[PDB]
Protein: Adhesin
Organism: Haemophilus influenzae
Amino acid sequence: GLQGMDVVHGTATMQVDGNKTIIRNSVDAIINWKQFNIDQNEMVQFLQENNNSAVFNRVTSNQISQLKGILDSNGQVFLINPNGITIGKDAIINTNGFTASTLDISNENIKARNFTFEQTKDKALAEIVNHGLITVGKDGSVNLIGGKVKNEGVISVNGGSISLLAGQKITISDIINPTITYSIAAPENEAVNLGDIFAKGGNINVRAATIRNQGKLSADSVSKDKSGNIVLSAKEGEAEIGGVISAQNQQAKGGKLMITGDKVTLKTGAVIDLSGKEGGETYLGGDERGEGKNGIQLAKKTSLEKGSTINVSGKEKGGRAIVWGDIALIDGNINAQGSGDIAKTGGFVETSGHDLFIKDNAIVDAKEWLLD
């Protein structure tokens, strides 16, 4: 399904052996394509000069990328396609870093390593959908950047970062372990997780106008030396949080979870699990007393629904849960228990707003529970 190869920076050769295509590219080569498809029984390999090498691929036609077979590389693979990118249910993308973007980035910015992506005005919003397996066995990251970003399959890395970024303009500090240094999303820019995302102690970042989680976001660790960090920002819209968000570490301290946006909802049945030997830490809807320190967004409305659970407990010592909403509705369970008696080893829970409603199903188990 690879058509119309045109190497516009660097050098790249193509070898076809049956259902397998091997592309040998120079470090940081840029290749344009009329079509970048990988059919079900096809395999594409980017054989790079070292494991830190990247290759940049751009579809310049109207052809949506249908990735149904195997895409692999010892280095990093970047795919740009403003028509959309769809990874099929039996597809495996196995690299040391995978970036798929429906937002455009110039050759000039690639060469400068200025990773600024912007929605083209000349095409409708497009989607990145993963139905298959996107996997990194080593240290690399996965970045999915688009008009809408949807995971229905599995994305799995080994201590690196996974970022689902939907917006009109997105700048990341790097393509490995990115910090989002600039982001603007329109209401139609949504990031949706129906499948499972695993970072094994690493980072998960999700940024869109609206975020919907029905599946699992996991940065669980089984190593004492590393705990995960999960950040969701639905700045222009709602963070609708169902499913499971986990960053446990039963060998040490649980990880950190921050969920902010204009509206933050933890739905009935949803579980946040940041437990460990010592409980982890979560900020939901803003910070202590709604001060807005460190530029954190204060939600206009934060609701923890009946039958939702925040677990920041520890076998030895409870963790920390900070909840803010200009209107704040607290109706779920918040467990910040430690070992024996709570007055000694329990954690710290703050739930506040300008209008605070501690509703009748609310249960908070902590050493200290603050209402301001």
Residues 107-112 form the longest helix (6 residues). The helical segments are 107-112, 342-345. The longest strand covers residues 229-241.
